[PDB]
């Protein structure tokens, strides 16, 4: 069914396709993943596979995590994340200790990359919500960037919740859908994905088969 892998955003570069068009590609280190646990309906109520990724010194792991990894039967990894499948038929193709690499995907496939958006800090309504500012001249008094009105006058009497105002921005999980895989370099465990994927370089991402275009 839906495949998936844990990886790292390396950066963006340029390639040219066979028709000489240029393709902006994000390079993802779809490094080797090891299956650490299988979630089954008979035990957990849902079907899922849990993958581990990244390298860490064994002295950096705490005793509970090391115990979980030892019970699974593999050496610890930095990152652990779960892939939600649909049914046990889709869970039967994974077993603990199995190694997942970048070649599970193919050239021209469609993927959904999930990462953590870049942080923006405390942002104003103009940046956080695209509010049009007020005028820069013609008498406007210290309202060049302020939101303006906030509600009604009597019948509202309050501010409706969900009202868009300034606050913290970014640092949220974001999924980009229907990205095309331009090339699957099997030597370096590298995926060439056309477009921009969420997060900063060196961030952790999950690449999954697209849910709409697949």
């Amino acid at each position: 069914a839906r495949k998936g892998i844990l990886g790292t955003k390396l950066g963006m570069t340029q390639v040219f396709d066979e028709n000489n068009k240029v393709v902006p590609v994000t390079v993802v280190k779809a490094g080797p993943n090891v299956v650490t646990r299988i979630r089954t309906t008979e035990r957990d109520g849902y079907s899922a596979v849990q993958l581990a990724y990244g390298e860490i010194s064994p002295r950096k792991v705490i005793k509970p995590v090391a115990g979980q990894f030892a019970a699974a039967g593999v050496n610890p990894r930095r990152h652990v994340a779960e892939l939600r499948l649909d049914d046990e038929a889709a869970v039967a193709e994974y077993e603990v200790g199995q190694e997942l690499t970048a070649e599970i995907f193919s050239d021209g496939a469609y993927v959904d990359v999930t990462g953590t958006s870049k942080g923006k800090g405390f942002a104003g309504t103009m940046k956080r919500h695209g509010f049009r500012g007020q005028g820069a001249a013609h008498g406007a008094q210290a309202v060049h960037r302020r939101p303006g009105s906030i509600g009604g006058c009597a019948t509202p009497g309050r501010v409706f919740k969900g009202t868009r105002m300034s606050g913290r921005m970014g640092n949220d999980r974001v999924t980009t859908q229907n990205l095309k895989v331009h090339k699957v370099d099997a030597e370096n465990g590298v995926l060439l994905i056309k477009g921009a994927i969420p997060g900063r370089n060196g961030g952790l991402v999950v690449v999954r088969s697209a849910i709409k275009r697949g």
Binding site: Q14, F16, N20, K21, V22
Partner: protein, 122 residues
């Protein structure tokens, strides 16, 4: 990148020297007209003896822009002025002679007569 109230030199021989953009056709609240886009324009400056007159509401197609424009193969084209060619409803020039180079974008937009008449197409 041409918008409303922008002024364009006329690269034809219809007698119009300069037109002002009134509307960028091709969708509601459309903002900018690049190479190959069709605009509604009014003539601001005209040759004294030409067929067109000042204040005529005409239709033109943008053929040169100062703002550089990306192409499919990653290349860019840029000109030193914004120019337009006055056309009729069948996408044919109202003049008989095109001045200066034009962009390749007029081919995919099916402006074959203008492309043929142009001194050179880039």
């Amino acid at each position: 990148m041409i918008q409303q109230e922008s002024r364009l030199k006329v690269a034809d021989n219809t007698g119009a020297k300069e037109i002002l953009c009134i509307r960028v056709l091709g969708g509601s609240s459309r903002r900018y007209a690049g190479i190959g886009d069709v605009i509604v324009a009014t003539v601001k400056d005209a040759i004294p003896g030409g067929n067109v007159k000042r204040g005529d509401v005409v239709k033109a197609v943008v053929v040169r822009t100062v703002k550089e424009r990306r192409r499919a193969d990653g290349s860019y084209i840029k000109f030193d002025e914004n120019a337009a060619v006055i056309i009729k409803n069948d996408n044919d020039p109202r003049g008989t002679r095109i001045f200066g180079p034009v962009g390749r974008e007029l081919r995919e937009k099916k402006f074959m007569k203008i492309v043929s008449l142009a001194p050179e197409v880039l």
